[PDB]
Design the sequence.
């Protein structure tokens, strides 16, 4: 064996973010709105870095698809096009690759020309996905063999996505070890794992599995960063990269590249003849525009910097190694212009039709049986809760706050654009696994905030759960009268205080906003298994209409609220 | 690809049976004692068949070691010698390969020149077993590649044998699929699995895992046979071989070769260009001597057939395709003669010394506090129970019947031969996982048989369990007064009716003999997880003395029995 060097360049979890998106940083001491990401910047940066560095290896760690209308309106073809233009060496399957079933994955893979790897996701012969990817590949650098193994997250995909029954999944840790062990006798001592298992599982693999040198990560969406990125108050979770020892005592490196086309990770690796990795270069490149630099003025308005203040802002960004400004790729620009124009036409098409009476929503209807409201209150909120309930086969009930719906939902045609109009906040679906007693408590919390302590927008409505409550609390301080949960037997049953339910809600109240105290306490406590699904609210609404293209409006809100009189 | 044929020749679970052993068959209508097996016959038959057939593949499916003094007195060197003389192509690790720790396995592997395979048993770098075997091998027949993958049983090895902590084990099904899946892209469509997982798990693999054509089995000790062997009333469990379809619809063949050097399995396989297996020859060869043909006469004595009756017996055996008479190999005969002579010397060596007072046993001492007995009864039986308790780290308590010990155990030197004198019945250790209430019941059963319904030899004594009982049953028909089990905290605690204990006993009473009704009912009911460990009783006694080379005799039997007066 001889020593060799590799230049790993990687992204993950772009989730159909073909265009840039807004974020906030602390620049020269002030909170500043800026634009980051987009696939034109990704491809431009990959193209420039791969020509600059010896032995580049260009990787995508999964969840190419789902998250914007660029997926929904094109079935993956837009994502395939921009990925092809980046000339990635390998792509591994994520969890969202299965969101539209085997059928949906096939539609991505057909136009995609990037080699696909996944060692623990294995289709049977009759599957439409048979022979569409391989478990590993071996490439040669300066005479040396290097293996790369693909890997997906298991439970999350099986439970929260929609793979077909003819696709078999295998344990992440076992697959990683068995794959690496088999490669040894082929004279291979340099092994890369391209894994959508998430940071937590990949860190476990690093510490429990031998013979794997680098684990390029997706699924967790973590920014692995450095002091430069910390100085901008970006959400840095870990240093780029993390380092462990495996049971044999050899170093293992683990790193992710944030999400949503925001970062190109850049890791230079030298391997000893015996295949031990060391780091020669480590840069998480944040892709940023120079054109939006907005700060909040004294009237509360976000305004562009001007004059010397703008110059100082630009100078600071230009001086940073980990910020890359205004990268753009001509080919990718052409593709995105084409898809953007098509998207604007397609988004005006009808996804479904609603018949019947208007479903009351907005501020006036937040609380049932109040002046200016109606006896059912915000039926539109129940509707939104139903769109959330429809996402996951595993979910027992969902809860949505009335303030998350800004107007009545009226009968007539519903377009893709309309869904984004109905739901302007950009929430994703978030789940907890929680006892019935806590479900009762969060409803109590929300009603208390809505009626007494805060905004009426906190008032809760659910799908798969229905309740009666009094405005006036009883002797024990409780407003709830009855709570039922739908047996997914299809009969309504009394909630069970001791049963652990899988509960879905929006990301906003999941963190405890709007007085949802109970959710606030469950957040980050692993006992409750909290997870951000990254399924956007407007997209959930679109799926619901696709399922009910001729939907008869609900006439009840799953809430009976006895107002004080 | 081209079509190719393979001639698989295999044994399994020889368990150090270098010499023939006795069995009983139904020959010409009469029960007949005959000798079968031995490694001279194995090697002779393998040698003759491999020269007769094209493309022979000669395999050993594990548990080469443990079961006779040929292991104990030689540490595996005798087994290695006879295996080497058979020129096997591959050996896979079984469960008993770890009975004497990594240290014991190393002693087998050092002299062993047969390539070793095991894909789901993987030593860490610092292990003394590092790099002593490979997960798979690829060989070429007439230009075609065929892969062979090794596999071991997991839970049984980890729990009931003694592998070191630096040896990691992986799931049988996952390993089989991941290994086979990885081999595909190397242009391999013919795959053999050499698996000590046992028949049950191998049958599951055949039905749940793709891309594996033949599974050559060890661990279960099942005779896979045919109508010829059924006619002799041999213990045929399945047809040689079994056939399944995998999830992809392709055929999979599974077969074992009984145990204890008794059978050479002979399976001719043709593979299509696409790697689909079909059977061209299927013979389970039972290796039998022509020299012992004994039937029971009218005085109850076993006597050799003579004259025309002997001739008819021989003629019947000679006419059978699946019986092979008097195979012997010159080289192996020389090895066995050498080891047999050495064994006779070594077996007279001292394994331990007992000091103190005689431990009463035999018929006179079966029941405590009876005429001709002593207040403690059969302390020697408690001793034997302790030797059983010492075998498995997992076992909570053991129970031994007093009739299983034929004499007092006196102070002084104990040799290897002495252990086989102490314990002449040839039992192995058998376990059940059973509730405390059933433990109470089996003690009640045994006492009832000993005192009223049958032989006094049924009277039970235990290790890790102690009890008080009255000869006269109470109003509820029960003799037990108290039952305690040793917390493995090292404090005695009351038995818990609802706790499931791992209970060890001998194979004889495990089947319900001697009135052990409760064990009889647990037998073959999978709820109770019954398993024959194949750990022989005399060998357990030898291990105990090795652990206590200067053992002070027990003075109590773990039983307080209040005789009726
Ligand atoms: N991200 C969000 N998701 C749902 N509701 C929101 C969000 N942001 C604000 N609201 C609602 O709007 C109100 C503030 O106008 C809040 O009380 C809340 O009910
Ligand atoms: N295989 C055996 N294991 C233990 N005890 C046995 C066995 N065979 C016979 N005995 C004992 O010997 C008695 C018959 O003499 C039985 O009642 C039983 O107690
Ligand atoms: Zn993602
Ligand atoms: Zn993901
Ligand atoms: Zn065995
Ligand atoms: Zn075994």
Sequence:
């Amino acid at each position: 064996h001889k020593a060799v060097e590799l230049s790993i360049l990687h992204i993950n979890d772009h989730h159909s973010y073909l265009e840039p998106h807004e974020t906030r940083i602390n620049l020269n001491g002030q909170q500043t709105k800026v634009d980051i990401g987009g696939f034109s910047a990704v491809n431009a940066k990959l193209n420039k870095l791969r020509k600059k560095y010896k032995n580049p290896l260009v990787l995508h760690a999964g969840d190419a698809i789902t998250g914007t209308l660029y997926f929904t309106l094109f079935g993956g073809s837009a994502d395939a096009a921009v990925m092809n233009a980046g000339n990635f060496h390998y792509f591994t399957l994520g969890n969202h690759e299965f969101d539209a079933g085997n059928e949906g994955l096939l539609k991505l893979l057909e136009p995609l020309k990037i080699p696909v790897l996944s060692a623990n996701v294995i289709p049977d012969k009759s599957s439409i996905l048979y022979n569409k990817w391989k478990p590993y590949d071996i490439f040669t650098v300066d005479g040396e063999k290097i293996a790369i193994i693909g890997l997906d997250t298991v439970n999350k995909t099986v439970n929260s996505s929609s793979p077909g029954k003819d696709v078999k999944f295998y344990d992440e840790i076992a697959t990683a070890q068995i794959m690496a062990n088999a490669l040894k006798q082929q004279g291979i001592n340099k092994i890369i794992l391209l894994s959508h298992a998430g940071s937590e599982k990949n860190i476990e693999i690093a510490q429990k599995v031998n013979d794997i040198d680098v684990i390029v990560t997706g699924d967790s969406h973590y920014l692995y960063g450095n002091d430069e990125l910390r100085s901008l108050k970006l959400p840095v979770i870990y240093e780029y990269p993390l380092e462990f020892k495996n049971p044999n005592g050899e170093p293992v490196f683990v790193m992710e590249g944030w999400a949503y086309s925001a970062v190109v990770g850049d890791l230079g690796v030298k391997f000893s003849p015996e295949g031990i990795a060391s780091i020669t270069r480590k840069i998480p490149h944040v892709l940023m525009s120079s054109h939006k630099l907005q700060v909040k003025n004294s009237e509360g308005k976000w305004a562009e910097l001007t004059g010397d203040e703008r110059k100082k802002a630009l100078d600071t960004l230009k001086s940073m190694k980990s910020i890359s400004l205004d990268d753009h790729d001509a080919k990718t620009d052409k593709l995105i212009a084409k898809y953007k124009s098509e998207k604007d036409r397609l988004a005006q098409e009808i996804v479904g039709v609603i018949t019947g009476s208007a479903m009351p929503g907005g501020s006036a209807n937040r609380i049932p049986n109040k002046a200016g409201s109606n006896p059912e209150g915000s039926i539109a909120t129940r509707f939104i809760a139903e769109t959330m309930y429809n996402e996951l086969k595993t979910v027992d009930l969902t809860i949505q706050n009335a303030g998350g719906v800004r107007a009545d939902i009226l009968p007539g045609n519903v377009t893709f654009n309309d869904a984004y109009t109905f739901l302007p906040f950009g929430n994703t679906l978030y789940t907890y696994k929680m006892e019935g007693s806590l479900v009762k408590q969060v409803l109590e919390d929300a009603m208390q905030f809505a009626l007494v302590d805060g905004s009426t927008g906190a008032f809760p409505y659910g799908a798969g759960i229905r309740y009666e409550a009094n405005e006036t609390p009883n002797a024990e301080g409780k407003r709830l009268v009855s709570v039922e949960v739908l047996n997914k037997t299809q009969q309504w049953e009394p909630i069970d205080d001791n049963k652990r339910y899988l509960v879905g809600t929006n990301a906003y109240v999941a963190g405890g906003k709007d007085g949802y105290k109970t959710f606030g306490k469950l957040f980050n406590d692993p006992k409750y298994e909290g997870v951000d699904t990254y399924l956007p609210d407007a997209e959930s609404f679109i799926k619901f209409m696709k399922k009910h293209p001729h939907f008869e409006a609900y006439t009840s809100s799953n809430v009976k609220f006895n107002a004080s009189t």
About this structure: Chain B is about 30% helix and 30% strand. The CA atoms of residues 121 and 535 of chain B lie 22 Å apart. The longest strand of chain B covers residues 277-288.
